Symmetry: D2
Subunit: 171 residues, 4 copies
């Protein structure tokens, strides 16, 4: 397991920001990959003062492919676009998103993820660290605990406490 | 020139409807290709009692490719989809739309257009008549008149009358 | 009884709206098509006045078997920022005016420069006259784009191409 | 002065909201994230309570140089039908409450089964208490997700990693 603190997450986000500036790529539009790239997109936005954020509803059931459910954006024609996600695992998600954004004829599509898995089909133009361990983000920790309560995350006892009551009241 | 009356347009729409029913394809979702496939989608909808219509904002500047500006839809997963447009010229537009809908993982994507140009790259699964003449639809007649007032359409004099005043008041 | 405007009348309706818009010097930056009856009106007006920017709102007034509501229900809003823009809301008929009002309120929250409404037809009991309209009518209107919906719920209305429709409708009812 | 909640406090805030939601037996069908400050709150609550359906509204209260408005402005609404659903509106702070109210009104027009509001923090002068909240505060709140926006407009606020930010910000100001 790799279980980044928010402090690490912040450093991941600073790194991306530093790389984007160093390489001269200041996006006009951030495309958040819902829902995991939600927090990364908002943090990068605030860091680099990027005021335009759009969103794509896509999920990779683990279905054989990622499935787009909704694309929340206005015209992207002639704009500098950065696709933001939290991790590139197989890389299917970043590929599918990049393929569909391109159809909006932007000036440029680049990709950022916080973390990379070694076996990714697609390597983000910008990332923080490549990890061969199982990553547990602060925003999917409970989904991971619901699938294995033996995962060593903090505040689990407060969570198990609430989840128990939750399980009772909606069956 | 081919300048279909609404009566012809209605027959074009009945034909598509007849073909869809005869072939057993009753869509769950109509995707209107904005803005030319707008009236065709609404007429087919009413004809076949299809209550679910979604929309895609795409235009082919005549830019080298059609450009998607917006996709107005919720999940299409496992649904029977019909893409509706008014004409397939080069076929670029129907291809681009069909490519992006597929990413929503529907059950099936089929295409309908009212009219086909002989040189289309993509042939709609359903169409009314193939025309090698320049088609002037009832809903783009004035765009055509603004580009050549010598086109033999009806009510042109009423239109030239209004267009003249229009040209004055917004420069 | 019923009003059944020809396509020729709808063109005249659209023309009249365009003529009134130019006469009032209100040329919209953005057309807001009220889905789905406002679809054809909005497209034709777009072509008439060379208005290239059309946006859409999915709103429905449920008045039928089982599913029935007292007010229109918005189901989706299809638009980018309307901020500082002259907006014209386009629909086919204002009946009670509940739909135009609902759409006007929701569009106002986008802070446009101005919101105006246009509907082709109007009923005497509409709770507000649209800023632009072709004809006030007191019959129930069957449009070219909802005729088969009316025939389905009322087989004996006098419409063109009925037998042709009935045959298609027959084959639709059986494929169940 | 300023309130600057740690990430640890935001987790506790989210937890408190979740705990209150379960205690009230109000488990939302749909989360409505108020963009953009409500983004992180909505995602974390989604994970906490296993709520899989998140929708979004692009709304902004312009309170800055040149561009300034008296009320929030909606710029886009990102949702399918909310009809018959239990909806929870999630935001980071209710200040005047003008935003929560605007979002509540617009969501109501989708005819949900119910609309409830949650904001992590609350000011004593809010025109309405959200149905769910972590803490009433009277300082101006600097969140983890808008800290650099505050530093930019106010260089002398006491935030972590300031020098690192200033160096990046410096290189941003020059690439003009
Ligand atoms: O490279 P891949 O193999 O495609 O993996 C990457 C994607 O998988 C996860 O998303 P997910 O489909 O789980 O949805 P979520 O973001 O809502 O959690 C993750 O957030 C990435 O978006
Ligand atoms: O097969 P193609 O060569 O791509 O031509 C087909 C498309 O071209 C037209 O759309 P257009 O781009 O003009 O936009 P519009 O529908 O708004 O008129 C037409 O309505 C079709 O959608
Ligand atoms: O003035 P009102 O009393 O509100 O009625 C007018 C509305 O009713 C119809 O819409 P409908 O809700 O039936 O949906 P539709 O446009 O898809 O036919 C019509 O298109 C108007 O929008
Ligand atoms: O109660 P109010 O007086 O209406 O203020 C509260 C709102 O202000 C902030 O949003 P903002 O409009 O600044 O946009 P943002 O979420 O993108 O930061 C904040 O996120 C709340 O949404
Ligand atoms: Mg994801
Ligand atoms: Mg077209
Ligand atoms: Mg209507
Ligand atoms: Mg906000």
């Amino acid at each position: 397991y790799h279980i980044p603190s928010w402090d690490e997450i912040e450093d991941a986000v600073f790194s991306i920001g530093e790389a984007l500036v160093k390489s001269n790529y200041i996006p006009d539009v951030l495309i958040a990959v819902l829902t995991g790239g939600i927090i990364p997109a908002k943090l990068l936005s605030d860091l680099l003062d990027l005021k335009v954020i759009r969103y794509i509803d896509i999920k990779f059931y683990r279905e054989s492919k990622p499935v787009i459910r909704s694309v929340y954006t206005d015209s992207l024609e002639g704009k500098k676009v950065l696709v933001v996600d939290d991790v590139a695992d197989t890389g299917e998600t970043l590929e599918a998103v990049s393929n569909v954004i391109t159809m909006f004829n932007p000036a440029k599509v680049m990709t950022a993820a916080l973390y990379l898995k070694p076996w990714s089909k697609r390597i983000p133009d910008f990332y923080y660290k490549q990890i061969d361990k199982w990553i547990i983000f602060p925003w999917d920790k409970w989904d991971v605990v619901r699938e294995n309560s033996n995962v060593p995350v903090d505040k689990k006892e407060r969570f198990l406490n609430l989840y128990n009551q939750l399980l009772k009241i909606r069956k």
